[PDB]
Amino acid sequence: KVNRSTALLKSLSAERERWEKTSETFKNQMSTI
C-alpha cells in the first residue's frame, strides 16, 4: 500500500536523523571518558 510505504519512509528518515544524533552524543561521551 502507498500510505504504508510513505509512513515507513517518514519513520525511517526520522530514525536516520535520530541515529546521527546518537552517534554525535556517543562521540561526545568519547571525548569525555
Angle, CA of 17, 23 and 13, to the nearest 5°:
15
Cell numbers at 5, concatenated: 510505504
Distance, in Å, from the CA atom of 8 to the CA atom of 28, rounded to the nearest integer, reads 30
Distance, in Å, from the CA atom of 21 to the CA atom of 28, rounded to the nearest integer, reads 10
What phi, psi does 32 have (nearest 5°)? -120, 85
Distance, in Å, from the CA atom of 33 to the CA atom of 24, rounded to the nearest integer, reads 15
Q: Residue count of the chain, please give it.
A: 33
* Residue for grid cell 504504508: 4
Distance, in Å, from the CA atom of 20 to the CA atom of 13, rounded to the nearest integer, reads 11
Distance, in Å, from the CA atom of 22 to the CA atom of 27, rounded to the nearest integer, reads 9
Resolution of the coordinates, Å: 3.4
Tell me the H-state helices in 1-33.
2-31
Distance, in Å, from the CA atom of 21 to the CA atom of 11, rounded to the nearest integer, reads 15
Distance, in Å, from the CA atom of 9 to the CA atom of 2, rounded to the nearest integer, reads 11
Question: What SS3 state is found at 33?
Answer: coil
